[PDB]
Amino acid sequence: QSLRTLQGHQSAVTSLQFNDNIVVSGSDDSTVKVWDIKTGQSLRTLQGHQSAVTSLQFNDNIVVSGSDDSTVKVWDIKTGQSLRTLQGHQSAVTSLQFNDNIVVSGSDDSTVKVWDIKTGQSLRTLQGHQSAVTSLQFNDNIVVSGSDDSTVKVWDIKTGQSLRTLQGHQSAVTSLQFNDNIVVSGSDDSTVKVWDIKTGQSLRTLQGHQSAVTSLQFNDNIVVSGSDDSTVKVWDIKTGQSLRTLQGHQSAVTSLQFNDNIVVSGSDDSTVKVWDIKTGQSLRTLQGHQSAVTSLQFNDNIVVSGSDDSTVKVWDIKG
Numbered sequence: 097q098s099l100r101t102l103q104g105h106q107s108a109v110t111s112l113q114f115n116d117n118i119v120v121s122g123s124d125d126s127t128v129k130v131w132d133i134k135t136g137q138s139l140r141t142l143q144g145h146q147s148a149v150t151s152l153q154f155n156d157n158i159v160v161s162g163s164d165d166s167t168v169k170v171w172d173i174k175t176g177q178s179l180r181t182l183q184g185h186q187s188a189v190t191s192l193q194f195n196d197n198i199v200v201s202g203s204d205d206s207t208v209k210v211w212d213i214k215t216g217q218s219l220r221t222l223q224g225h226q227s228a229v230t231s232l233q234f235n236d237n238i239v240v241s242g243s244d245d246s247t248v249k250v251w252d253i254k255t256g257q258s259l260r261t262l263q264g265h266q267s268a269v270t271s272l273q274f275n276d277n278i279v280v281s282g283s284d285d286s287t288v289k290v291w292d293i294k295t296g297q298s299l300r301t302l303q304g305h306q307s308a309v310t311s312l313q314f315n316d317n318i319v320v321s322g323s324d325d326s327t328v329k330v331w332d333i334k335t336g337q338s339l340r341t342l343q344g345h346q347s348a349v350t351s352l353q354f355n356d357n358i359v360v361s362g363s364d365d366s367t368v369k370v371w372d373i374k375t376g377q378s379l380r381t382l383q384g385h386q387s388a389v390t391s392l393q394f395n396d397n398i399v400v401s402g403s404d405d406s407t408v409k410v411w412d413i414k415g
Contacts, residue, residue, distance in 0.1 A: 098384050099398075100136030100410040104129060109402030111152050112391045119400055120159055120173075121408050122149030128161050130173060133400075133410060140176035144169060151192050160199055162189030168201050168211070180216040184209055191232045198253070200239055202229030208241050210253060220256035224249055231272045238293075240279055242269030248281050250293060260296030264289055271312050280319055280333070282309030288321050290333060300336035304329055311352050320359055322349030328361050328371070340376040344369055351392045358413070360399055362389030368401050370413060382411050 107124035114120070118139075119131040128142040128149055147164035154160070158179070159171040168182040168189055187204035194200070198219065199211040208222035208229055227244035234240070238259070239251040246267055250260035267284035274280070278299075279291040288302040288309055307324035314320070318339070319331040328342040328349055347364035354360070358379070359371040368382035368389055387404035394400070399411040 097412045097415040098382070098409055099412055100133065101384075102129075102131045102136055102138070102408040102410070103406075104138050104141075105406045107148075107406055108387075108390065108404040109406060109408055110148065110150055110390055112393060112400060112402045112408060113152060113154055114393055114395070114398075114400045115154070118154075118173075119408060119410070120152060120154045121402055122152045122161055123406070124148040125406075126163070126165075128152060128159060128171070130159070130176070131408070133398075136410065142169075142171045142176055142178070144178045144181075147188075150188065150190055153192060153194055160192060160194045162192045162201055164188040166203065166205075168192060168199060170199075170213070170216070182209075182211050182216065182218070184218050184221075187228075190228065190230055193232060193234055198234075200232060200234050200253075202232045202241055204228040206243070206245075208232060208239060208251070210239070210256070222249075222251050222256055222258070224258050224261075227268075230268065230270055233272060233274055238274075240272060240274045240293075242272040242281055244268040246283070246285075248272060248279060248291070250279070250296065260293065262289075262291050262296055262298070264298050264301075267308075270308065270310055273312060273314055275314070278314075278333075280312060280314045282312045282321055284308040286323070286325075288312060288319060288331070290319070290336070302329075302331045302336055302338070304338045304341075307348075310348065310350055313352060313354055320352060320354045322352045322361055324348040326363065326365075328352060328359060330359075330373070330376070342369075342371050342376065342378070344378050344381075347388075350388065350390055353392060353394055358394075360392060360394050360413075362392045362401055364388040366403070366405075368392060368399060368411070370399075380415075382409075384409055
């Protein structure tokens, strides 16, 4: 059942995150909105970007947002005030991640930038990709970036040096995750690849989707991938074998998340589906959005979805 509909953005929701009773959403209308999940009402609107918001992350103190206007902005989540604009990228910011030390952003300009979050200054520019950076993740030592140039690169965050270049996809990398010595990447070439970060070599290629891979998540046992072919697939990460194809969506799967009980997927067909991961069967379809679902997050018995219809919805996972 739909619990709340968060109305107020004037164009498509591109990105969202939620934590306890706060939802933060980014939109093509160039704003970020902060919402109270209890009453489904807007708390404040973060105004200042000059084009679409593509990406965001927030914590207890701040929101960090990336835009088509080529900036990253740091905001105070409680006052709504813009604190710092990180200027430097020459084209749209597509992805970002931050912690207490650094902001890391990827851009259509083919670079990844590392910014000192405390001083608000650029620390280094990671140069080497030949086309747009689409996706990134970092930890302690390492940034991992995926690109329209069909490669994944692994970088030394402290020196800016390229450590590994993961070559093998035949088209753009759309999505990636890494954990310990494993990178998993999804591509427009319709495959997922599993890579060894130690040697920068591919471990196996997960073949089976009939169109681009848009999204993935993995754990110790399995990879779950969503595709333009409208399916989600569950794979064994060690054998590379397809285990289950989740069929039901009527158009491209744009987003997904899973745990030990369920897979939750969002689609261009305007629905969110909840699947029993153990039985491989659909449990329910969340109907109500009037256009494509672009983004989702779930936590315990709550799903939050963003849509091209300009709303965010909050759903009861078990009903």
